[PDB]
Amino acid sequence: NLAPLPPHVPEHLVFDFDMYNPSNLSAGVQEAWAVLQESNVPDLVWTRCNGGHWIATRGQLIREAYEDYRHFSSECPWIPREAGEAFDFIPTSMDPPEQRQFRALANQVVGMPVVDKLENRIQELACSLIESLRPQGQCNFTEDYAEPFPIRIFMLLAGLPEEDIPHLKYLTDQMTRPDGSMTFAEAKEALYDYLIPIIEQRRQKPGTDAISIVANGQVNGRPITSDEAKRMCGLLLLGGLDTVVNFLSFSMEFLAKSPEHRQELIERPERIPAACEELLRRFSLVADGRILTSDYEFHGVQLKKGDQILLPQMLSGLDERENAAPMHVDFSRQKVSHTTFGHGSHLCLGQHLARREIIVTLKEWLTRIPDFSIAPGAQIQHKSGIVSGVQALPLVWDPATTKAV
Ligand code: HEM
Ligand SMILES: Clc1cc(Cl)cc(Cl)c1
Numbered sequence: 001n002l003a004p005l006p007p008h009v010p011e012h013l014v015f016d017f018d019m020y021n022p023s024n025l026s027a028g029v030q031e032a033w034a035v036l037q038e039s040n041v042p043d044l045v046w047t048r049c050n051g052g053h054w055i056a057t058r059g060q061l062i063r064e065a066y067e068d069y070r071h072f073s074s075e076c077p078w079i080p081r082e083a084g085e086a087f088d089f090i091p092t093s094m095d096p097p098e099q100r101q102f103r104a105l106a107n108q109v110v111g112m113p114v115v116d117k118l119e120n121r122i123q124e125l126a127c128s129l130i131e132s133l134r135p136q137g138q139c140n141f142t143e144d145y146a147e148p149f150p151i152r153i154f155m156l157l158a159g160l161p162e163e164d165i166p167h168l169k170y171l172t173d174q175m176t177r178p179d180g181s182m183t184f185a186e187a188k189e190a191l192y193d194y195l196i197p198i199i200e201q202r203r204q205k206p207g208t209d210a211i212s213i214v215a216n217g218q219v220n221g222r223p224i225t226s227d228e229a230k231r232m233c234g235l236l237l238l239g240g241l242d243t244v245v246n247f248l249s250f251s252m253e254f255l256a257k258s259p260e261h262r263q264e265l266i267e268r269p270e271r272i273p274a275a276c277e278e279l280l281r282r283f284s285l286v287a288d289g290r291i292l293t294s295d296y297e298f299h300g301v302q303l304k305k306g307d308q309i310l311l312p313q314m315l316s317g318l319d320e321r322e323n324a325a326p327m328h329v330d331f332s333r334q335k336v337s338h339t340t341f342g343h344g345s346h347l348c349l350g351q352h353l354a355r356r357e358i359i360v361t362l363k364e365w366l367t368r369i370p371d372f373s374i375a376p377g378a379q380i381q382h383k384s385g386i387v388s389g390v391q392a393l394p395l396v397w398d399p400a401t402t403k404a405v
């Protein structure tokens with residue numbers, strides 16, 4: 001429950017927020033986290049939960065911390081601390097200057113150029129998936145679309161067989177939202193155990209998949225180690241299975257509950273992209289953090305070398321000091337401001353892939369199923385963690401209102 005308050009942490013700045021089971025969860029994860037932005041909550045608080053750590057509650061501080069990699073190292077980026085210490089993925093667990101040489105190689109496998117080529121294939125699967133669901137007049141969105149659409153595309157980029165999805169997604173989720181069956185340490189080992197034989201195999205018969213490309217790659221000219229490649233592939237895997245999956249569910253849930261918005265995108269299709277950014281702001285869902293390299297006074301607070309601080313990428317865009325009426329989805333919002341894909345040297349390499357997936361989803365679903373709602377009486381539950389998500393989303397619609405392409 002609560003870790004004893006470190007001697008150096010001010011008693012008045014304690015706000016025991018639990019990132020894996022927030023108080024207000026039933027109001028929605030974002031509303032649960034937004035409690036940290038209420039009227040008398042400080043810019044920086046200390047929660048005694050999960051072993052104890054700082055939490056920056058406003059975008060201005062969240063932004064400076066991410067920019068200041070000398071004081072806030074990504075080396076122990078996960079909470080609780082034990083997870084943070086075993087977290088050795090590349091390049092995420094590294095800080096410039098060493099981080100860069102690997103970030104470039106990772107960028108080559110999932111970046112915009114790679115996305116452009118994946119284009120037609122992504123669209124085909126969105127359609128294949130939506131049309132096949134169309135005439136049923138119902139589906140449980142998380143397992144019938146949110147998960148297979150994103151993951152499949154990733155399993156293809158990685159050139160991995162879909163039969164492995166259940167195992168990999170189980171491991172990934174134990175990392176983002178552990179249910180207790182396994183520790184971060186155990187989850188990563190099993191993921192590292194999965195990859196090893198693949199990395200050695202694609203290192204002898206080099207294919208064109210992302211795995212082969214990282215396995216046979218070079219960092220600023222010298223050869224990548226088998227181990228370096230594993231730590232890098234493991235992260236990509238994490239980034240491919242538990243990001244978009246969850247975000248799509250948040251967006252589609254909001255759309256199921258707001259006909260007005262649906263209609264806006266139906267009547268005015270050119271707004272889909274902007275709506276996509278606005279949805280990313282509103283339904284932001286990642287929160288990881290950093291560890292203090294030395295003792296440092298930050299915004300009037302004494303941080304002690306070794307303290308962990310959670311910098312909720314999720315919170316920036318929900319900050320009223322960044323966007324007025326933040327909880328309000330406005331597809332015409334003139335300055336959509338957020339840090340949903342992060343901030344600093346670790347900006348999300350997969351945002352171009354994520355945006356395309358999101359925008360093709362909106363376009364193709366609204367085209368075939370403009371009217372849909374949450375199943376009657378269904379009580380939607382969110383889940384909080386490093387990546388927040390949706391437990392299930394039952395959707396229903398009248399087949400008669402649909403249109404095949
Ligand atoms: C809605 C979708 C997504 C969101 C909100 C998101 C968010 C983030 C955030 C917040 C970070 C920064 C972590 C930090 O600073 O510790 C990050 C890093 C990263 N993400 Fe994304 N992500 C998404 C989708 C993806 C996808 C589809 C991939 C590709 C598999 C991916 C690959 C990566 C990589 C490789 C990094 C690490 C960059 C580095 O550490 O330099 N992400 N992402
Ligand atoms: Cl820590 C982390 C790492 C990746 Cl790859 C994606 C997200 Cl969302 C968080």
Ligand SMILES: [K+]
Binds near residue numbers: 076084085088
């Ligand atoms: K570590």
